[PDB]
Amino acid sequence: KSLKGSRTEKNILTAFAGESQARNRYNYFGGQAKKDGFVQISDIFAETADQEREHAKRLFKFLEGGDLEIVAAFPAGIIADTHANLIASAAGEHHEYTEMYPSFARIAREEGYEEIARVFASIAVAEEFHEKRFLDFARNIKEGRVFLREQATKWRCRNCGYVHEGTGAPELCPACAHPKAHFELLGINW
Amino acid sequence: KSLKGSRTEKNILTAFAGESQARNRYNYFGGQAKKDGFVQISDIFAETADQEREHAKRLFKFLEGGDLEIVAAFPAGIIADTHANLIASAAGEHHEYTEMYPSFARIAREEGYEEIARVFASIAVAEEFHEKRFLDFARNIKEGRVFLREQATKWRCRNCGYVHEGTGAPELCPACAHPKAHFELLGINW
Ligand SMILES: [Fe+2]
Ligand SMILES: [Fe+2]
Ligand SMILES: [Fe+2]
Ligand SMILES: [Fe+2]
Ligand SMILES: [Fe+2]
Ligand SMILES: [Fe+2]
């Protein structure tokens, strides 16, 4: 049925507004992460921003047109160091998957919008993993484990693919000469 | 010392030529992988192409100028199905890390170009992992394990970040509605 006049219609636009701002914030944090010498984290922020773009698109497509007024609170700033940005981002993700989306989903189910409710619940799953990544990286930074680990392991240069074996990433990639900032733990998800 | 007239100078340009063609081939294969419904593989081809761009840049920067003639054989085509493209790509990587770069490195050391020799040896390491990825993905396709596994595991939608738990990726992402093609095994390399 139509969304016109329902609380769900307002909630969808509210979610769209938040998703849109998150995309921008994450891209800015990605830029800051690059400046702070954290390439993997920078690319993660960029990827997360792209995924928020997709959450927003799905939501946007449910709308039926017209200008709708919404009342909502958003983070007024700010861009800080990468650790701080990761913490702030995780906090935003947390509110989304623990409070906002579950609430929007429940209201959607109550008003009879089952498909939309399932979408809100599904997006919440994505946001929870987004938070996990942000918290994990913040922890790595705080503990000084981004480029150094207890036992020897494999590190991959994101710039050229060079693989280094050791307790920590090298100061300079021996293949492409790019700085340590480009290294990440070698991952194999296949 | 100067590279002018050395065999290493020729080898560097030869490597640059091959690296350059590999970049194009991989980008084309990436496009084909997208058409075949393999998003993770498509992005891997694109990333690999970007890394070949960097191998080429490091090599290019060693050169001292002028037009140099080279004699070398290259793959004349072709673009086929993704499995075939992965196999062909792996074969190219194999020649590079088992024959070409080790030979270029040895000649470089013999002519007194230690830094360049180390770069050739280092690039070879990158190419070996490139091959591993290509062979692994080709095997997944051949065995029908790209989107389905024996035991239940976690699958991530590359488009929106949704996480699905089960033996296989869903036909449609419940969050962004994109097809199964966008799913990959959830990876955590940090
Ligand atoms: Fe989102
Ligand atoms: Fe998110
Ligand atoms: Fe590198
Ligand atoms: Fe290469
Ligand atoms: Fe390669
Ligand atoms: Fe999705």
Curated annotation (Swiss-Prot), chains A, B:
PROSITE patterns: FERRITIN_LIKE, RUBREDOXIN_LIKE. Fe(3+) 3 binds at C157, C160, C173, C176. Fe(3+) 1 binds at E19, E52, E96, E127. One of its GO terms (molecular function) is iron ion binding. One of its GO terms (cellular component) is cytoplasm. Fe(3+) 2 binds at E52, E93, E127, H130. Binds 3 Fe(3+) ions per subunit. Its cofactor is Fe(3+). Residues 1-145 form the Ferritin-like diiron domain. Keywords: Cytoplasm, Electron transport, Iron, Metal-binding, Transport, Zinc. Residues 152-190 form the Rubredoxin-like domain. It is found in: Cytoplasm. Homodimer. Possesses two rubredoxin-like centers and two non-sulfur oxo-bridged di-iron centers per dimer. May provide oxidative stress protection via catalytic reduction of intracellular hydrogen peroxide. This is Rubrerythrin. It comes from Nitratidesulfovibrio vulgaris (strain ATCC 29579 / DSM 644 / CCUG 34227 / NCIMB 8303 / VKM B-1760 / Hildenborough) (Desulfovibrio vulgaris).
